[PDB]
Ligand binder design. Structure first.
Ligand SMILES: CCC(C)(C)c1ccc(S(=O)(=O)N[C@@H](Cc2ccccc2)[C@@H](O)Cc2nc(N(C)C)no2)cc1
Ligand SMILES: CCC(C)(C)c1ccc(S(=O)(=O)N[C@@H](Cc2ccccc2)[C@@H](O)Cc2nc(N(C)C)no2)cc1
Length: 277
């Protein structure tokens, strides 16, 4: 079922069988988010999921790649991710092609960059914690105390979350460990994405593109309110296919919208099966 950070969603047969689909977890989720999609792919398509690991996007990809190669050798690799999962899947594609492997398909499920660039100032840090508090108040129906932003401004990201945690606690909200963990790791995944530089990629990428970011995303980061038609990826990917799916970011992995992703993706997998012969 789960081996290290690999989840089997559908095991491959001992020999032969279709090309496996590798899916990568989003922020604050496991790879069980990909079950609806699995149900929209051909019968007997294997699927394996990469769960969370620590580091820069690059350092995460560096841990996934040894395992991808252990499971699939030379290729063909099919790599899919929703949201952060999409960033991870693409990082892995970069790395696999550089090692001389065969990546046939990268499917970014609404992995869309913020419409504008995020400063790097002490003011932005203050504003981001403000937005996080408003999100946490709405999401958990609690009161978050005002933070003294001096002596937090100067810390790194982990130092910043540690301090906000001590502040929430000292105000008298005891947070379940599971929730502390989840929100810390999600926040740090967001920071990993933001500080990563996207690398050019001369393979085929498919971007499944929703209409907009959902409310909580826009509340957390207002720049998600604006989208480039190419999701920010046209800069880096010469062979980019953009498939419109409608709806919001958060509905992209739910029915009915995942039927569009699944239909399109099935034909891609069909072509790949036709050629392995
Ligand atoms: C559901 C997975 C996924 C990837 C789609 C997701 C993960 C996390 C979030 S969140 O961080 O922005 N909000 C969460 C806040 C929380 C964290 C930890 C413990 C309890 C709660 C929940 O509200 C989310 C959630 N949705 C549901 N539904 C039943 C819709 N349950 O939890 C949003 C979507
Ligand atoms: C830390 C608190 C919380 C729950 C609000 C949060 C914030 C930010 C993220 S995120 O970094 O994973 N943001 C996602 C959009 C979203 C917002 C909000 C919720 C889910 C999802 C995509 O924006 C990622 C993503 N980046 C890209 N790029 C191309 C850079 N593609 O997808 C995740 C949870």
């Amino acid at each position: 079922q789960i081996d290290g950070f690999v989840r089997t969603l559908r095991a491959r047969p001992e020999a032969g069988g279709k090309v496996p689909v590798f899916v990568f977890h989003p922020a604050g989720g496991s790879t069980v988010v990909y079950e609806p999609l699995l149900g929209r792919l051909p019968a007997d398509t294997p699927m394996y999921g990469f769960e969370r690991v620590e580091g820069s996007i690059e350092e995460r990809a560096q841990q996934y790649v040894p395992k991808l190669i252990e499971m699939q050798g030379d290729g063909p690799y099919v790599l899919v991710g929703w949201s952060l999962g999409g960033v991870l899947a693409y990082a892995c594609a970069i790395g696999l092609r550089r090692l001389g492997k065969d990546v046939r398909f990268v499917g970014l499920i609404d992995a869309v960059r913020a419409g504008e660039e995020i400063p790097q100032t002490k003011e932005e840090i203050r504003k981001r914690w403000d937005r996080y508090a408003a999100f946490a108040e709405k999401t958990f129906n609690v009161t978050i105390p005002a933070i003294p932003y001096e002596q937090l401004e100067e810390l790194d990201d982990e130092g910043q979350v540690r301090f906000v945690l001590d502040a929430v606690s000292q105000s008298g909200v005891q947070i379940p460990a599971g929730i502390i963990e989840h929100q810390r790791t999600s926040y740090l995944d967001n920071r990993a994405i933001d500080t990563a530089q996207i690398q050019p990629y001369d393979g085929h990428v498919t971007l499944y593109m929703a209409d907009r970011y959902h409310d909580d995303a826009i509340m957390f980061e207002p720049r998600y309110a604006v989208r480039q038609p190419d999701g920010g990826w046209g800069e880096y990917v010469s062979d980019l296919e953009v498939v419109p799916i409608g709806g919001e970011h958060i509905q992209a992995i739910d029915e009915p919208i995942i039927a569009k992703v699944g239909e399109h993706m099935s034909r891609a997998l069909g072509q790949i099966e036709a050629d392995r012969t």
